[PDB]
Design a protein around this nucleic acid. Structure first.
Lengths: 236, 236
DNA sequence: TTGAGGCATTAACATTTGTTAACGACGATA
DNA sequence: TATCGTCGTTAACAAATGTTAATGCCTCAA
């Protein structure tokens, strides 16, 4: 919040202007690999990839402020062919070309650490998500994904913890957990309603047994405690 | 590697001298969190985590030279509770306190960008691995892990590509794929031998149909092409 | 009001994977 | 030489997941 806003000012004082994106349009994509250093300031986006069969995969979400790399800082080559779709109504972004990045960082040292810090946050997040999505099959994958959603998009209400997210269909949850068919996702969420872990109200998800999700995503809950401890405190 | 040698001479100049670990040792562990910056210079290691009920998870392997870190750079707090076990007969490691690192990379930038490069390699590697493991179930996870081990520990032989890796049991393949029982991995392997994809010789695996593994792990093959071009080029 | 499309739910069937046990090969020990 | 433990293989069964289709609820357009 603070270390990021300080980074914003350093960008405006170097000619980097914020380019605002609206919902559903792709900042970068997998078919036109262009190496940038996206600095999502305010907004919500999802990193996706489309197989050759047209199969969709949602790798993760990004809520500003955060940094996303589409190319390497040295070789200036692509880190992978992915898409960064905007899913919030409006999201402002400070896009930076990979070339000038190496220069802007070598000047200010405190902001080099910031980008380096967020990259470490990225690594720990991927290992934890990988650890919990592999042990308990797809039930644990849905539980882990839901746990992630509750922490960064959750708010406490008398009905439970409301996950403030439009859309969030059965199809979209399946993409974030590697489930291709919507019927399979529903079959699992119908078990979580039976178990009394979640309820479906207002086309919106309320979780009531957060501990049940921790048992299926202990490494992810461990990550929020160590990486985003403020987000962890709101629910503990 | 050149960058890893300049870095190695940079550490030896500032008083950091190597340490020798033997097989089965743990550089760090998940029960005594110490925040180091591990510069694995020569040797092979696997990052693991033990769940509270005792199930092992093999997150990935590390082959020197590379950079692993158990704590964040600015806060110096743990990034996660993992074990780094030495699986080669011996390994040469340069342990450096997390605080000393901030000053060292502050003096010399070309080594700061080298550490940043290795981290970008880590991010894109985790996203790619998470992509191919989540889409095709356990068959696609075993196929993905084998693809990783061929590019890194594979060599052209008359019987295909030999995975030059010792003590690669069925358990260790399962731990890397979230499979808990060696019976399940043997079942998947007997099918890959049936389809003439691999052969089991002298407790080692020989890969004879690399293209079969690419169709089940396309983004990992893409990652080796974009991140480790030299390693990839030796098998195409 | 009627009718089209998308989403959620459930059903059923097929395939895969989880789980445990038995068999046989191999090494190592005394 | 006999005996013990480790590992791979296969089998059998239960459970989970992949796949398809049918149904009902809801929105929207005319």
């Amino acid at each position: 919040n603070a270390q990021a806003e300080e980074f914003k000012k350093y960008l405006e004082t170097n000619g980097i202007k914020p380019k605002q994106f609206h919902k559903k349009e792709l900042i970068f994509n997998q078919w036109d690999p262009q190496e940038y250093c996206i600095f999502l300031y305010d907004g919500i986006t999802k990193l996706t990839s489309i197989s050759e069969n047209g199969t969709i995969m949602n790798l993760q979400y990004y809520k500003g402020a955060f940094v996303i790399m589409s190319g390497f800082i040295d070789t200036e080559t692509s880190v992978g062919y992915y898409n960064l779709e905007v899913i919030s109504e409006q999201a402002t972004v400070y896009v930076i070309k990979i070339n000038e990045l190496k220069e802007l960082l070598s000047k200010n040292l405190t902001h080099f650490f910031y980008v380096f810090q967020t990259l470490q946050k990225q690594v720990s997040y991927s290992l934890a998500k990988f650890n919990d999505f592999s042990i308990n099959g797809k039930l644990g994958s849905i539980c882990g994904q839901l746990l992630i959603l509750t922490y960064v998009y959750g708010k406490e209400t008398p009905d439970g913890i409301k996950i403030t997210l439009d859309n969030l269909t059965m199809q979209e949850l399946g993409y974030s957990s590697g489930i291709a068919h919507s019927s399979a996702v529903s079959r699992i969420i119908s078990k979580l309603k039976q178990e009394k872990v979640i309820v479906y109200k207002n086309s919106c998800f309320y979780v009531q047994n957060l501990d049940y999700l921790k048992r299926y995503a202990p490494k992810l809950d461990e990550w929020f405690y160590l990486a985003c401890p403020a987000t962890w405190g709101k629910l503990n």
